[PDB]
Specification:
mainly alpha, Growth Hormone, Chain: A, 5-stranded antiparallel beta sheet, 18 helices, 63% helix, binds cholesterol hemisuccinate, binds 3,5,3',5'-tetraiodo-L-thyronine, transport protein, SLC transporter
Length: 546
Amino acid sequence: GELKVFLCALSFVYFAKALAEGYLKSTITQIERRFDIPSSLVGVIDGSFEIGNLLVITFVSYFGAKLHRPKIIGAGCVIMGVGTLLIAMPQFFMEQYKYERSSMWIYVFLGNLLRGIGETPIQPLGIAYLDDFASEDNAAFYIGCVQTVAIIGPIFGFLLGSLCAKLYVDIGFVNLDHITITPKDPQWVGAWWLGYLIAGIISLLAAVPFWYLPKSLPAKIMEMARDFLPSLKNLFGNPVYFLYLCTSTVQFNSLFGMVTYKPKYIEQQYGQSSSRANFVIGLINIPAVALGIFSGGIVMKKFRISVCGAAKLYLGSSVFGYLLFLSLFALGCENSDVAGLTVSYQGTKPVSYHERALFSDCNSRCKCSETKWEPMCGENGITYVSACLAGCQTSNRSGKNIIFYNCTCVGISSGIVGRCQKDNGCPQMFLYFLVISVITSYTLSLGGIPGYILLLRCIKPQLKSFALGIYTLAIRVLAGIPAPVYFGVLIDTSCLKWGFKRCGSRGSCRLYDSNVFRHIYLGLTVILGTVSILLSIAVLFILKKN
Ligand SMILES: CC(C)CCC[C@@H](C)[C@H]1CC[C@H]2[C@@H]3CC=C4C[C@@H](OC(=O)CCC(=O)O)CC[C@]4(C)[C@H]3CC[C@]12C
Ligand SMILES: N[C@@H](Cc1cc(I)c(Oc2cc(I)c(O)c(I)c2)c(I)c1)C(=O)O
């Protein structure tokens, strides 16, 4: 009936917003390159969405509750689509991309800001509506379906990003027969704008069903303004709601931190390429998370689980997920031998901080750059920071490979390009890591829908959307924003070799200490998870008491 139609429309809106998010994440680097803006303005573009979302989420979730919720959702979709289309606008006004053979970025800012605004009503009003009119058993399953869509959607955004990056930026504007560069060329820019047009159109189409959906299923603003403060105290005077908010905030501090640096952990700890890390996370781990969320919804529906049972399932999923995550401490690889950083040039195992001599006797004759990181794998099994630092004098191109010779440090003499592959059982450790991380992701996500149901049922019904708004504001502000920052700071304390930008400032870290990285990355996650587990126990105790 009308409830099923609303569920389908909300699922399509979730898909549209997720696809836009994925495409934006895939193309932000191309946008930075095309517009010739510094990384600070790139972070500003990425953060305009969040400014827009956080500034109006509370107002929308509170006042929109008594209004026509389907129509507010449709208006939000329209604003989302307009903002998405605004990002592609500068393509139609800037000059042709000239490659070696400026103020239009504000639009990219403004459009993203509109996206942040247009997303705000979708979750608080959409879920509350779903919870108001579905039967008690079916609500959890419907919410699970919607959240599964939200989890899976960005993969399509990244696929569209790749497809549009395969096309030239000035396609349709310029004859392509006069262009001598290929996607492999570093000067190539893809059709970044095309995906924004597609996503904006999809978002505008997503708004259409919400103008035919009813407000309810089987002066006032000034009066809501007066009751705003009493309603806030009602939500935060509620102990189950407040403690579940704290529990979720701490658990998401753990989870955002773990997820953000999981690709880098895979690449650094297990010697995998960035592409392989992204493939295993996006194509294996994310489906496991989606399956966990959906199965939590299924379990809530099938066994008619109550609020107390939902709290128990949330606690159990957290407990067993973090216990499984503990086993990752034993799946560790040792540091690869890097001359001067992890080992000395004589092949002696780990020197200390006070012994990091990028220059040695075997490379004193050569004037090599310290800041440059062009690692090569020598025949001796020791990785060197650069071929110059090994005294390599001749280089020959054999097929797709480049081989150095007469490398004095190696002979204490050939070397190929890249880091030496990790040999002693590290691929097996990485396979175990993959299996355990997939299982852990599924197990942790198995409690996602139960906690959501706990939040929705612990409060008086008329506050649902408002509570959902506040929850969303909390997770974003107290977990989503801060956790990547301080996780990054603590992890970067394990850096052995800093990359340097053209201005002399530090760039991305090139070599980490594997043991310190593993300890920090896993321990911070587990400690936050343990705090969350204790808070969840408190939530369960109060639920039993009341
Ligand atoms: C927490 C934040 C900071 C990052 C969240 C990680 C994931 C949600 C995202 C980030 C990078 C994304 C991946 C990077 C790009 C790709 C390639 C993309 O297209 C391809 O398969 C490559 C095509 C080609 O070979 O050219 C498929 C999805 C995937 C794995 C993405 C899936 C979703 C990922 C893992
Ligand atoms: N920009 C996105 C980034 C993001 C996506 C997912 I999906 C996610 O959820 C999980 C949970 C577990 I457990 C995992 O192992 C993995 I991988 C992802 C988290 I946290 C963050 C967002 O913030 O929504």
